[PDB]
Amino acid sequence: MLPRLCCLEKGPNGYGFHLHGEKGKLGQYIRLVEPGSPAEKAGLLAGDRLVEVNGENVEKETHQQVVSRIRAALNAVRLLVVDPENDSLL
Template identity: 55%
Template sequence: MGDENSFAPRLCTIRKWPDFGGYGFNLHAERGRAGQYIGKVDDDSPAQAAGMKEGDRIVEVNGTNIGNENHSQVVTRIKAAGDVVTMLLMDSETDSYFKERKVVVSSDMPEVVRMETPPRSGQEEEEVRI
């Protein structure tokens, strides 16, 4: 375990790439365990490039806290985002750190690290072509 500065929620902006199907991650929920989690993250995917990691707990989707939403509601929220979705994520150590201190985590906290999928080379030009 590191010092308290090492516990930082990540605000990941995941941008789909034209040559990759989807964002590149699975949503995971377990019976008896509250919350929605990131399952497998595909190698060389937009999700991986944005800093998403397997086991991360999802706190927010596009600025909305999803703590009281079920699996299908969160899936719907992510799909409704289109080609870009922003998710506030915490790994298990960061999650435990804030839970122990009874801190409600949100994307406007100063500790939040912002990460995003870089565009593929030539992506801007491809989006303009008709």
């Protein structure tokens, strides 16, 4: 069964979430999803690992590269995410 795909339209304060790396591990993860934000409305959850941004694999890209892809020059983003406790990359 398909990973969650969160489709967000940019709001007045952006999407409403933080993205961060974790020492000792690869990847970028969701944190601090703001109440009432497009992020919350789309079902993004703190702790989710970000796998794709707008159809492009960011599984192991750097923090800067992933942030740049989310910010792009677009006003909408599609985030493919997984729960790392339930999903592993092989």
